[PDB]
From a paper:
VRK2 also phosphorylates p53 and BAF (Blanco et al., 2006; Nichols et al., 2006). VRK2 has two splice forms that localize either to the nucleus and cytoplasm or to the ER and mitochondria (Blanco et al., 2006). VRK2 is also well structured, except for the ATP-binding glycine-rich loop (G-loop, G36-G41) and N67 in the loop linking β3 to αC. The unstructured G-loop is commonly seen in kinase structures without bound ATP. In contrast, the VRK3 G-loop is well ordered, with low B-values that indicate that it is rigid in the absence of ATP. Both kinase structures are in an active conformation: the two lobes of the kinase domain are closed, αC is rotated inwards, and a key ion pair between K72-E91PKA is formed. The overall structures of VRK3 and VRK2 are similar and superimpose with an RMSD of 2.3 Å, using 291 main-chain positions. In the C-terminal lobe, two helices are shortened in VRK2 relative to VRK3 and CK1: αD is truncated, containing only a half a helical turn, and αI is shortened and loses its distinctive kink. In VRK2, residues 206–208 form a short 3-10 helix, with the charged R207 facing out to the solvent, opening a groove through the middle of the activation loop that might participate in substrate binding. T213 is found in most serine/threonine kinases, anchoring the loop and organizing the active site via hydrogen bonds to D166 and K168VRK2 in the hrDxkxxN catalytic loop motif (Nolen et al., 2004). T217VRK2 forms a hydrogen bond to the backbone of N211VRK2 to help stabilize the position of the activation segment, and thus its loss in VRK3 may reflect the change in conformation of this segment.
Author numbering: 15 to 35, 42 to 66, 68 to 330
The structure:
Amino acid sequence: FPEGKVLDDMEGNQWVLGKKILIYLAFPTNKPEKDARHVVKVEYQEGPLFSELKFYQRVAKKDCIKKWIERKQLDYLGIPLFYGSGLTEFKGRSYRFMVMERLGIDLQKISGQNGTFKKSTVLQLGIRMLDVLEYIHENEYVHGDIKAANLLLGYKNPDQVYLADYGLSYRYCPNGNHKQYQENPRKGHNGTIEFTSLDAHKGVALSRRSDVEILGYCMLRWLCGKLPWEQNLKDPVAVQTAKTNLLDELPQSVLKWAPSGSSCCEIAQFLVCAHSLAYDEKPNYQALKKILNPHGIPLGPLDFSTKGQ
Ligand SMILES: [Mg+2]
């Protein structure tokens, strides 16, 4: 798509495409380029963008997010804001597009030695992810794919972290009707194999516990530099049995995995809590957050320093 192309969203706002970063910078045709706080995401009418679109339209509403933030006394919530969407024509083909808040670099790009982060940063990231999970879960959605590549630093505030890429997102409780539990080995082992939940491995529709579980595996990976199933990633059944063994052997499976300079006591207890959840059970988000911050230290800046590496 050429820079300068004007897109018309369903609301009737007009947007001018900037340079590619497909994701492009976007400007409103009303304001000046100096004030560029938007990106446009473009795909054909052929899947994951439409999956993201249903999520962002239903959940990433500025005013509700604002009121939630005020009520729950959050400094922020790591959900990128949605501005509009629609279709544009390129030749004969139609493309779907979505205008979102511009964000910064992903965490996989900025990770230290062996995809690790400092323990305080790992624990803060999980707390920030728990705030997002509570919000999306309350709005009937699970993410399914938490990982460093899908965590992004802000643009307007580069010190805030966001959960992005709702391509594998799932509406688990449409209009209050929680999905039933059904194993389906024809739909087995979707997600990022390293981090995907046991329910995903079994072909079971994703529910709230799966996101908490995935977040636990992520924190473990970020802190320790590897997961026990690191050598088995091309064998999803081996990965499934490894994660099952890890959860069955809690807390020691996780406690013992940690290096001497970064305890896994918090992540061990987090996963003990996660593993106690029934399929349709609401996570106790407040308890999980206190588990990650057992001394109630106020959240500082995210430390991505690679001093010494
Ligand atoms: Mg299959």
